Design a protein around this ligand. Structure first.
Ligand SMILES: CCCCCCCCCCCCCCCCCC(=O)OC[C@H](COP(=O)(O)OCCN)OC(=O)CCCCCCCCCCCCCCCCC
Ligand code: HEC
Ligand code: HEC
Ligand code: HEM
Ligand code: HEM
Ligand code: HEM
Ligand SMILES: COc1c(O)c(C)c(C/C=C(\C)CC/C=C(\C)CC/C=C(/C)CC/C=C(\C)CC/C=C(\C)CCC=C(C)C)c(O)c1OC
Ligand SMILES: COc1c(O)c(C)c(C/C=C(\C)CC/C=C(\C)CC/C=C(/C)CC/C=C(\C)CC/C=C(\C)CCC=C(C)C)c(O)c1OC
Lengths: 236, 76, 373, 97, 164, 43, 38, 78, 64, 184
């Protein structure tokens, strides 16, 4: 199935990510997705954005005690975290996840959107595309039919429902609102520089629009001489 | 190097100063009509192959699509 | 001054043809790109490690934290893509205008291509994603096709039973050297060419009309550099993943593989050719010939005119060759199923028959039409 | 067939740039020898025509259609000479073997 | 002349002998790092599968697939025509336990991982070029010339399968 | 004198004698040295 | 190639053959001592 | 710092081509284990690196058997 | 109330989605139409799905 | 042939003085040493990791587990020492025999000498031993001497408050890249 198009705002050429949503999607990840998924490469410092400034990130940074700190022997989980603390992990070992995921693996979702062909869409679709299995459906273990899912046997447990959680902003927590919002966050994290870049690209387009006709005019100055040269053959 | 290149004789070559000739002769105005001429001359020999290709791609896609397309009747 | 004499001799007072079109910019662009790829590769190498342990991570760190890393990394990737775009257009210029009669320049040339192809696989395998891992195994296994010493060679390169850290670290060096290597080979290129001078699109002796290079083909190369930088920065800053495969952002699953595995676009057709030949060995050979057929090209010129400006039938055959090269690039992408396969088989047959058979016969016919043969 | 020749001629369009056929022959050694032997007048003329083409090509322009060397007008000057040069190489080759 | 040249010939062999030696060690350096090629160990339990369960073990950087075969799977694989197989190797020929099949996950073609539960003939499949392997790991369809590799499991007892 | 006229005067043969000699010289050198090392280190 | 078709040309080659084999032969033996194939 | 300089001794490997006495290396490996292993470990050294007449492989593996910690008996059980 | 549900419903109401749904309904009915058959309908299901989904995105995000 | 003409012009038909002693060998030795260093350096780069947690471990892994890795590492170190021996004797030949009147050659030489000293300093920092770290801090501190912009420059090079991983990795990059500039 080829996921159809979707009108993501940030995707606008010169427009950028809506941090508010991003924030909302980070909440969604913290309250739902972090039980099997973790933004390993993302740190509270990485988490910083209009969605969450370092200050807010600090709150979240202090909001966790899992594997943030080690003990006399650095085993298990022994102390809470701070700004530099990287995102907590639902599992201290791959086996742990495997164990708590039907034996399957709940992938950390740091670069998940980048990873999936048409990720942003896929994500939205998968989280909200279980649809209906009309026939020949034998979900073996903790699977969930989803035509959007490659095998319609996602096993990514559908973790979002109307008012699955409660957005602190108060925006109605409808499955879709929730899905779209977290999507933004996930996208934001996958490319912490999406906004940064697009500003460069705008400056690059303005500079090239200034510089291309001027360099063309120089070239046509120094090449006019020849382009006007008139040759004449005058055999004696 | 320049000099000692070719025995070219009697080929007067007049020229005009860069700052004396109009700085930027209109390209769209004068050049592109000829460009159109130029492109149209060759396109008549350039696009034909691609004309064929697009067709191949299009037919192939739908064909492969139908190939995947399963018939309820098949194994019915 | 003995250092400024060579610089003058190759870039300022070099007698160049006055009528060479923009195509002739492309090779200079390639030199600029190589520089870019290399310099970018340096920073990419910086803050990077060849360790499966930290290779994928520090890179993500480059994408996330390294100062302007996201910029240098995606400039490196899209500059490799721009390198192959300029390389393909350079080779197409050489094929169309009869520049392969400069045989030593062409051979330094054909070799150069193989090298650049490898650097791609090199750069490719290095981030240690899902796609890199499964791509490396695939082409490394290509070598196993060798009739007798194949297995050993594969294991040698891998440095073990299967690609693993042993490979990543060594592939790292080749990808740090081949760039330096190709660079030099290019230098050979420039020498073997100045002995003969550049060709012109009419294919005639341009000795009567040559101009300096400093004020005429320098500002032209500067303008071409500016346009190539515009396309490179709109590839980096606006669509940074339209040419890559998302699989890259997946740390290699030594265990699992991408349901759809495809070599990158620049080589897509190359593999398309392989997919076509039923025999494994046949595929490998044809694949090689695909690139090598070019080297073979200066011995297939049977016309009394160097360029294709005055040769319309061979122009038609050339554009049919470009057409089914684009077709082979598309097929490689398509999966294994009807009718993609047949097209692939034909397209490969048509490619080898146009280069080997149809163009010299057409050149003989064109010489017969002008009452020359 | 001859009509087809004229069509090819136009298509070749070397006439447009204002060049005769012998004008376009790649300067293979053999060609080089013949060119040299050309009576000076023709050689100088050849140069003029060739150079003109170069200039025209540079400006991406073609001469007035009328000025295009008509197929009929096109004459072969280098060829008469070239034939000899080729025969000469041939003679040397067998005395060689 | 023979005195002077013999010295040139003598010297050459000497240099030649040193040059092969220097080049040999270098070449050898990039050979398998001794530490990693010092890893040939393995540990597996045959009791980890209820039925029809493929179980790779990432051995030596290679999938130590250990798929399980239900009698049904066992029944079809035997039914497969060995002679008609691309690679003549009866299902049992590669397994000493019909309920237990063990394979190495490198596509005979270009070395990808052949995902299981895929492939028209059933069993395995390789997303790289479309090679379909049966439960026996025999290439039934695709650009895969040889069948999947069978490691020296040399099972000692139902309890433990060595799988070297 | 015969050797020169036979294996050392024609460069091709010069190479042949060199290569062949080197082929044998090495194994021996290795053996001798190894043996010496061994005699030198009796344990 | 036409030119290569010559009787003398042939004589020259015949006279040149032995030497050619030798260098190739040396190279052959050389490859052996070069690799010690296994 | 005034340090009485080590009084250079006559080691069986002191000579220019003089190798090591491997029985002495075997005895010194025993020394490490029983005495200093308490407060010193040959981290970069491995039982495979113990390949030498000083100790053959199979027996070395027994030594390898002796040591039993942090192998990761349980990966999920850590 | 998830706007997703509402929008999905709305799109379905779109005659285009209505017809696409017609196909799906006919086809899902077809799923149950025969047993020995292989009328999975996944194809037709997907057909309607994508069509409707296009409409959804065409008018969902804004509500979102 | 335009590639063989330069090789002939610089190594075969080059008119050389008939009476130059063995001291004139030394510069060619330096070139050989450069190639040797580059080759050995390349074979150190296939296993070295420029991380402060793993640099010493990678060096010990080269010496203990890579086949003949101790040989390539100690060839690299003693080849740096041989490079400086040949460099000092080359400079002494230039001083004794009045070869400094070739002024452009002499100035390109002293530029090469500065580049070789910087390359060897950062290479000695690279194994991340006790001596490498304190040695680096010391010379990096040398820069702080600069009257006004010293502190900044030092911190820049260090890439932080004090030499730490930030330095090691950029010193690996610079030590990799400078011998090719030395070759040019
Ligand atoms: C070591 C001494 C070797 C020796 O015998 O020196 C005598 C030699 C005499 O030189 P001369 O009289 O010109 O005769 C040469 C031809 N027989 O004199 C020489 O050999 C001259 C040797 C020139 C190179 C000497 C380099 C010495 C090391 C200099 C290192 C420091 C360089 C500056 C660093 C700052
Ligand atoms: C309580 C369990 C649970 C929650 C909550 C959960 N997941 Fe998952 N997820 C899983 C398991 C188990 C797998 C492994 C499935 C497999 O490997 O076959 C998985 C796998 C995935 C995959 C990989 C599928 C692919 O295309 O390869 C994606 C994407 C995914 N989840 C997305 C999400 C998103 C997005 C959310 C919330 C916004 C989420 N998950 C919440 C359990 C969960
Ligand atoms: C009681 C446990 C223990 C035993 C057993 C032991 N050592 Fe040590 N060793 C130590 C400690 C503690 C230090 C560090 C003391 C200090 O730095 O002040 C040390 C330091 C050393 C040093 C480093 C000296 C220096 O200058 O840094 C050497 C060498 C050494 N021991 C040799 C040995 C040898 C050889 C043996 C086996 C006969 C051995 N030790 C057995 C505890 C031990
Ligand atoms: C000597 C100069 C070069 C160095 C030091 C270098 C170094 C590197 C490094 C460290 C990476 C990994 C970082 C990354 O994932 O992007 C890399 C990736 C890559 N390099 Fe290079 N490189 C050099 C030249 C080249 C050239 C000339 C090419 C083109 C042929 C090339 C093509 C690539 C590609 C395709 C990648 C993969 C990019 C990706 O992850 O998508 N590099 N290079
Ligand atoms: C490493 C990649 C390459 C680089 C950097 C490179 C660079 C250059 C440069 C700078 C020139 C002089 C400018 C010009 O002629 O337009 C040139 C000329 C040329 N190159 Fe390349 N080149 C490369 C690969 C190739 C290949 C693969 C071929 C063969 C297909 C080729 C064929 C030629 C030819 C025929 C010319 C002379 C064309 C003419 O001036 O008429 N080059 N190259
Ligand atoms: C581009 C070529 C080169 C590369 C890739 C390279 C790479 C390396 C690497 C990876 C190391 C660390 C391994 C070790 O500890 O020995 C190293 C060490 C070193 N290198 Fe280089 N190097 C190169 C050229 C040179 C040159 C030309 C010199 C001499 C000026 C040099 C001097 C050193 C020194 C002194 C060390 C420290 C050796 C020690 O641990 O005692 N390197 N080099
Ligand atoms: C016909 O006139 C010329 C010409 O004379 C030359 C020398 C070059 C070569 C110009 C370059 C800028 C060389 C390529 C640039 C590089 C940076 C080379 C990179 C390789 C290195 C080893 C550095 C041309 O591209 C060219 O056509 C426009
Ligand atoms: C007579 O004057 C010369 C001389 O002209 C040359 C070219 C060389 C060069 C000799 C070589 C063997 C070349 C290697 C020397 C180098 C310095 C290599 C340089 C290359 C890189 C650093 C790369 C000499 O050694 C020399 O003095 C004897």
């Amino acid at each position: 199935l080829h996921p159809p198009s979707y009108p993501w705002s940030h995707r606008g050429l010169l427009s950028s990510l809506d941090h508010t949503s991003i924030r909302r999607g980070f909440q969604v990840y913290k309250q739902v997705c972090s039980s099997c998924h973790s933004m390993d490469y993302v740190a509270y410092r990485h988490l910083v954005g209009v969605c969450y400034t370092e200050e807010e990130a600090k709150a979240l940074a202090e909001e966790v005690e899992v594997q943030d700190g080690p003990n006399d022997d650095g085993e298990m989980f022994m102390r809470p975290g701070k700004l530099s603390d990287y995102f907590p992990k639902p599992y201290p070992n791959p086996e742990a996840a495997r164990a708590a995921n039907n034996g399957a693996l709940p992938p950390d979702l740091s670069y998940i959107v980048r990873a999936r062909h048409g990720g942003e869409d896929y994500v939205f679709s998968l989280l909200t595309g279980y649809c209906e299995p009309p026939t020949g459906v034998s979900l073996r273990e903790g699977l969930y039919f989803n035509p959007y899912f490659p095998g319609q046997a996602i096993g990514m447990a559908p973790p979002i429902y109307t008012e699955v959680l409660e957005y602190d902003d108060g925006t109605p927590a409808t499955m879709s609102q929730v899905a779209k919002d977290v999507a933004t966050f996930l996208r934001w994290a996958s490319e912490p520089e999406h906004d940064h870049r697009k500003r460069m690209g705008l400056k690059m387009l303005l500079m090239m629009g200034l510089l291309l006709p001027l360099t063309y005019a120089m070239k046509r100055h120094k090449w006019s001489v020849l382009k006007s040269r008139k040759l004449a053959y005058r055999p004696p | 190097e320049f000099g000692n290149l070719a025995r070219i004789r009697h080929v007067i070559s007049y020229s005009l100063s860069p700052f004396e000739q109009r700085a930027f002769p209109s390209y769209f105005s004068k050049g592109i009509p000829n460009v159109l001429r130029r492109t149209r001359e060759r396109i008549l020999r350039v696009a034909p192959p691609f004309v064929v290709v697009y067709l191949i791609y299009t037919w192939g896609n739908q064909e492969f699509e139908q190939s995947k397309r399963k018939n309820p009747a098949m194994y019915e | 001054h003995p250092l400024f004499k060579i610089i003058n001799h190759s870039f300022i007072d070099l007698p160049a043809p006055s009528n060479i079109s923009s195509w002739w910019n492309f090779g200079s662009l390639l030199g600029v790109c190589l520089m870019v790829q290399i310099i970018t590769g340096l920073f990419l190498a910086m803050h990077y490690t060849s360790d499966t342990m930290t290779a994928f991570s520090s890179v993500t760190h480059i994408c996330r934290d390294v100062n302007y890393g996201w910029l240098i990394r995606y400039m490196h990737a899209n500059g490799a893509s721009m390198f192959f775009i300029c390389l393909f257009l350079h080779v197409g210029r050489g094929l169309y205008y009869g520049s392969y009669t400069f045989m030593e320049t062409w051979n330094i040339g054909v070799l150069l291509l193989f090298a650049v192809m490898a650097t791609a696989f090199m750069g490719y395998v290095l981030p240690w994603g899902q796609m890199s891992f499964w791509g490396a195994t695939v082409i490394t296994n290509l070598l196993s096709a060798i009739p007798y010493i194949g297995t050993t060679l594969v294991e040698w390169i891998w440095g073990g039973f299967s690609v693993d850290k042993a490979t990543l670290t060594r592939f790292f060096a080749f990808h740090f050297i081949l760039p330096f290597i190709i660079a030099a080979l290019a230098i050979v290129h420039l020498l073997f060419l100045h002995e003969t001078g550049s060709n012109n699109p009419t294919g005639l002796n341009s000795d009567a009309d040559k101009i300096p290079f400093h004020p005429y083909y320098t500002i032209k190369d500067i303008l071409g550099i500016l346009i190539m930088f515009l396309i490179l920065m709109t590839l980096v800053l606006f669509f940074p993943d339209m040419l890559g495969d998302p699989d890259n952002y997946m740390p290699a699953n030594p265990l699992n593989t991408p349901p759809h595995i495809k070599p990158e676009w620049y080589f897509l057709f190359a593999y398309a050719i392989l997919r076509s030949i039923p025999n494994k060995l046949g595929g490998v050979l044809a694949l090689i010939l695909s690139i090598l057929i070019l080297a073979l090209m200066p011995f297939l010129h049977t016309s009394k005119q160097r360029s294709l400006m005055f040769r319309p039938i061979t122009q038609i055959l050339y554009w049919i060759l470009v057409a089914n090269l684009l077709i082979l690039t598309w097929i490689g992408g398509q999966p294994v199923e009807h009718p993609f396969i047949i097209i692939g088989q034909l397209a490969s047959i048509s490619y080898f028959s146009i280069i080997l058979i149809l163009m010299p016969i057409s050149g003989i016919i064109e010489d017969k039409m002008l009452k020359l043969y | 067939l001859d009509g087809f020749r004229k069509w090819y001629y136009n298509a070749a369009g070397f006439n447009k740039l204002g060049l005769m056929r012998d004008d376009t022959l790649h300067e293979t050694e053999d060609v080089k020898e013949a060119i040299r032997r050309l009576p000076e007048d023709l050689y100088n003329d050849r140069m003029f025509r060739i150079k003109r083409a170069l200039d025209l090509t540079m400006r991406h322009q073609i001469l007035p259609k009328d000025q295009w060397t008509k197929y009929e007008e096109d004459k072969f000057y280098l060829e008469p000479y070239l034939k000899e040069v080729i025969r000469e190489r041939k003679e040397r080759e067998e005395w060689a073997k | 002349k023979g005195f002077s040249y013999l010295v040139t010939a003598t010297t050459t062999v000497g240099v030649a002998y040193a040059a092969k030696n220097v080049v040999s060690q270098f070449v050898s350096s990039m050979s398998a790092s001794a530490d990693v090629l010092a890893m040939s160990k393995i540990e597996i339990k045959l009791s980890d599968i209820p039925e029809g369960k493929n179980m790779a073990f990432k051995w030596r950087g290679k999938p130590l697939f250990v798929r399980h075969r239900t009698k049904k799977e066992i029944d079809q694989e035997a039914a497969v025509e060995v002679s008609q197989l691309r690679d003549p190797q009866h299902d049992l020929d590669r397994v000493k336990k019909p309920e237990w099949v063990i394979l190495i996950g490198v596509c005979t073609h270009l070395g990808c991982v052949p995902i299981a539960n895929a492939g028209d003939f059933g069993g395995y499949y390789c997303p790289c070029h479309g090679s379909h392997y049966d439960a026996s790991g025999r290439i039934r369809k695709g650009p895969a010339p040889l069948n999947l590799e069978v490691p020296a499991y040399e099972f000692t007892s139902d309890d433990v399968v060595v799988v070297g | 004198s015969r050797l020169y006229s036979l294996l050392f005067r024609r460069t091709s043969t010069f190479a042949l004698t060199i290569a062949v000699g080197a082929l044998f010289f090495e194994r021996a050198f290795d053996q001798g040295a190894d043996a010496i090392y061994e005699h030198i280190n009796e344990g | 190639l036409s030119r290569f078709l010559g009787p003398r040309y042939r004589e020259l080659a015949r006279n040149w053959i032995p030497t050619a084999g030798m260098w190739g032969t040396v190279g052959a033996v050389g490859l052996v001592w070069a690799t010690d194939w296994r | 710092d005034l340090e009485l300089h080590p009084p250079s001794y006559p080691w069986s490997h002191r000579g220019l081509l003089s190798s090591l006495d491997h029985t002495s290396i075997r005895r010194g490996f025993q020394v490490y284990k029983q005495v200093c292993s308490s407060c010193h470990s040959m981290d970069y050294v491995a039982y495979r690196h113990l390949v030498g007449v000083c100790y053959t492989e199979e027996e070395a593996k027994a030594l390898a058997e002796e040591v039993e910690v942090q192998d990761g008996p349980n990966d999920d059980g850590e | 109330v998830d706007p997703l549900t509402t929008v999905r419903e709305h799109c379905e109401q779109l005659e285009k989605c209505v017809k696409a749904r017609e196909r799906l309904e006919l086809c899902d009915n077809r799923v149950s139409s025969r047993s020995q058959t292989e009328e999975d309908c996944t194809e037709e299901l997907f057909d309607f799905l994508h069509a409707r989904d296009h409409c959804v995105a065409h008018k969902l995000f804004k509500n979102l």
